[PDB]
């Protein structure tokens, strides 16, 4: 990005539609981390499906482990095959009853 192209910074109230727009998935389980496998849980606060792969060009299973399979969604896990830095910019949401 180039800083020499910014021109404005707008702030305002956010609606429920915007919150459901930004999110990549909804969290359901209060679980945090698996103590024995040392791998993120499912539908927790650290899940790999919602947020992103924990390791570079990897996934929950072992079907894809190389750098040439990027862009393909794992059909048994659902995890994207891409870098692990996407965990700093992908959010989630909680659906209140």
């Amino acid at each position: 990005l180039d800083v020499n192209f910014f021109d404005e910074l707008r702030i305002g109230l956010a609606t429920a539609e915007d919150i459901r727009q930004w999110s990549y998935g909804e969290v359901k389980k209060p679980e945090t981390i698996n103590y024995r496998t040392l791998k993120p849980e499912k539908d927790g606060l650290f899940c790999e499906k919602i947020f992103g792969p924990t390791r570079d060009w990897e996934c929950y299973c072992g079907k894809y482990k190389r750098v040439r399979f990027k862009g393909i969604i794992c059909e048994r896990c659902g995890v994207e095959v891409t870098r692990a830095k996407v965990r700093r910019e992908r959010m989630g949401h909680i659906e209140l009853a």
Partner: protein, 1104 residues
Amino acid sequence: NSVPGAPNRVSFAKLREPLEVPGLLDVQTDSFEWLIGSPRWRESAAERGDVNPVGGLEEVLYELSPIEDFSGSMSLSFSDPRFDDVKAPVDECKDKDMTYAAPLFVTAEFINNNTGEIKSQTVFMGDFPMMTEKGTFIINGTERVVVSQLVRSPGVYFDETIDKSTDKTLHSVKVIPSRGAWLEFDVDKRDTVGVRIDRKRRQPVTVLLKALGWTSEQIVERFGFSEIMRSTLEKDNTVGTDEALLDIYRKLRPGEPPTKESAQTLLENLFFKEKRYDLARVGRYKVNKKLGLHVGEPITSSTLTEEDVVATIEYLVRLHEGQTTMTVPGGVEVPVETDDIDHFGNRRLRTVGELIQNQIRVGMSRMERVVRERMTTQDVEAITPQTLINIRPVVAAIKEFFGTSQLSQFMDQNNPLSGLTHKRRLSALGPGGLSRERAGLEVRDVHPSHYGRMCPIETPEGPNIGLIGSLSVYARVNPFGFIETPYRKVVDGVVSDEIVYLTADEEDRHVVAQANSPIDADGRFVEPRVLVRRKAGEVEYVPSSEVDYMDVSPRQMVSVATAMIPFLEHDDANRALMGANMQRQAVPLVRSEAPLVGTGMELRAAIDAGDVVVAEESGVIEEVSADYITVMHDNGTRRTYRMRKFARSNHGTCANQCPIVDAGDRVEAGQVIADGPCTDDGEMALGKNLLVAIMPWEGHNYEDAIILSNRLVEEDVLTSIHIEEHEIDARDTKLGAEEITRDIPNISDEVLADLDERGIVRIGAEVRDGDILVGKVTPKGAREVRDTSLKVPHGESGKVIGIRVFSREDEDELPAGVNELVRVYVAQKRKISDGDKLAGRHGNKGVIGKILPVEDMPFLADGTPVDIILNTHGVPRRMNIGQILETHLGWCAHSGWKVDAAKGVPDWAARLPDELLEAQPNAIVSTPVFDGAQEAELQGLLSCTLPNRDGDVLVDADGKAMLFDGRSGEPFPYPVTVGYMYIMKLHHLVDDKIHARSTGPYSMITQQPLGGKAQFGGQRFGEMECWAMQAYGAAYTLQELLTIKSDDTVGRVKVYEAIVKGENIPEPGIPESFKVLLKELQSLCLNVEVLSSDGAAIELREGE
């Protein structure tokens, strides 16, 4: 003197002393002796006022019991505490990382009122930490000190404020309890007396009198003269006690309908109770001493009464009137006045015993609640005392106090003086005191009542100025918590020799004379008028016929570190403050030597600290070596003393003990047998004697810098050993488990010569920064092992002096999971260099600017170079002229003198003793702190000094000598001041403060460099440093400093590559902290977006 074997130090004192300083560590040990209940305290309490020898734990155990239930069928009680033997000695506890403690047992009985049977058995209530013989605790292997706390006393406190409109004096009472509610009577600007029960708006006080059970007749009788009370009565219109009761319950019960029985339950469950209000013994005393109720009677029954309330109102209205004396029906006559909340008669001291007793009480109350709640859910006939008692709350409270607490502090062991001073500290902060922000400017002042109880000079220099102080040498603590000080009783104008201890609240009714007062042979005052201290600290010049008491010694008002500065009365207060604070930062040196000029406090400040070895009995010496001394007593018993050779203190210094006795000497009880860290023949020695010149020199000592000689480096005058410790572990990981071994695949055999056939370095190997100490390979259950070898942290070196390996296979207590814990020690002899800090006892302070060859130094007429040069521009403007007097006296003591008395004693030497009329070279003298050598005596001694080898007198009658110039050869045109001064080395060394970084570890959330020197961190470029950059006009330096050196993740690598390859530096991008901020703002449901010149918000996430 008064010590069996001591150096002969002649003194300049002209006054005699009728008292000796007490044990200097009895403020710590006496409180624990009271808490434990040992026979020593029992005998001491039997010596005077033997009424209730109640221990510290016993009164808690007796206030608790009996514990009853709601039905009233069973009860439980406790009695007879007793302690077992300590599990392990001190050295084992310090070695294996344990706690020094002894088990505690109590006896409990269970009575059943329905049947009548009794079942009693002994229960175990956990391990109790114990205090060593030096007043310190060993908690988890680390030495700790509990610090006394200065708090307000629980009692009544009348005050007075003025208005702003009418400017009339409005008063306000305030019964402060120990644990409970908060009555707060007050008067107002019209004419209404009002109470504010439990902080709730206000109300009239007649309603409260009615609610207690008083009627118009009695009220208007007790409240006559006062027109304010009449006006107060005729306003409420409360026609009946019911009215008052309902109103009280109305105001104090919001969201609830006022009931009658509930009001008579509140105003019963609030003050006159036993578990909801508890004016302790200090409370009852301080309430019975102001209002003046029941005198002669004891202090049992510690709940409030109607009497006190009434007397309070009486006091208030009479103070609003003017009556200076008041008598409550059935009592004594007590004066009526307002009181100060910072008087040492109102501030009490909470020592270590009362600080541990509170936590024990809290744990006891929690356990009592648990047992009361569980007594109603179990089945009878199966209830035993062991099944009703839970130990966990008590041990939890004890271990929470002795660990994460603000008053149990890590002990500082820089040198013996700092350790002794830590145990005599009175701190005004803590859970129940003050705050660094709430405390103002009136709690940090020297009240006139501090004379003899607190030191007015020794105090911190930062944000804790006035919140921390030190106890004086002669002070001692009441059984209530009030500090006392001694005085000599005088009768008929003659000073006697009977000592009476007085508290600050009792010395304001007497006239107390001054220590420096002329007293004849019989004991009659010479001067017609004497300087005394009157009631409100008023100093006056009264004719000497009213004195009632006298001081014991001129050094009664100073602490133990301030009483070690010679010529203190010639120094300003700020410089003496710095000198006292900097005497506790000196480091021990490899060789020690006692001062040429001292004060006499240095001998008993080293024995009482406890870092020396003294003999407990009399006998002859049988065997002496470098690490043990064997003494044969006269009766036949033989005792052997061991030594600590090269032990590491809390701050990394060296603690080494050496014997100072021969192989046939006779030893008396109390004689010093072995030396210590900073000790020379039994007396404290923190520095060295150096020859000084006061003159400017080519600008090398400009602005508080110091010039040294090279003879101080070639002769190891200022050298100190520093020992450091490191450790590694072997905690079984997931797959497999770590195992320390010499086999580190990825490393070769070159960097493996040291490591023996076990994986640990060999005692004697010199290490650098990068050397491997112990090598460990974490596996997976090889081609899976990692390189995890303990290395020497950057910038550290020295020989390996010892190892200590703990393994569970040989039966040892290691934290579960770990299998191997090694501890390596490394020592380094450090010399003096540029940047190191030196100091004196008077406030002199500076870093070393240059070190010069011995041929480049100014030298005396016989060729003797000087050792240190100090500037003359800093003395007159700082008002510390004691250093010049010290140099004169040091030269006189070093050279030696002799006064001629062929034609009688000269006029200036009339008052000198007979042993100070002649001295030998290298003599030791002593000048007490406020009664020492005058200036006529110094001027007369400076013209009597002995010559040197050749019959030459180098220093003339003014104390000045002619020096030669070592670089050009010509003599200096004017004489210069020469002498000897005492110089100490401070623990601020340049080798521990240098740091630099190019790249290193980074943070995680905001990818900025880490902070600190141990983590290889960067330096903060704060807000104030950006304003200077913006005012200079430097727009590119700021941008580079803020983006490509801190946060621009993609630009950091390209910048490094460009610098290495020699190309141009690229253009900065966008910092990561901004994106973190944007996601923070978006997580609070805020729709913040970055637009372009034509809308169409930018994505701001890269990825393409």
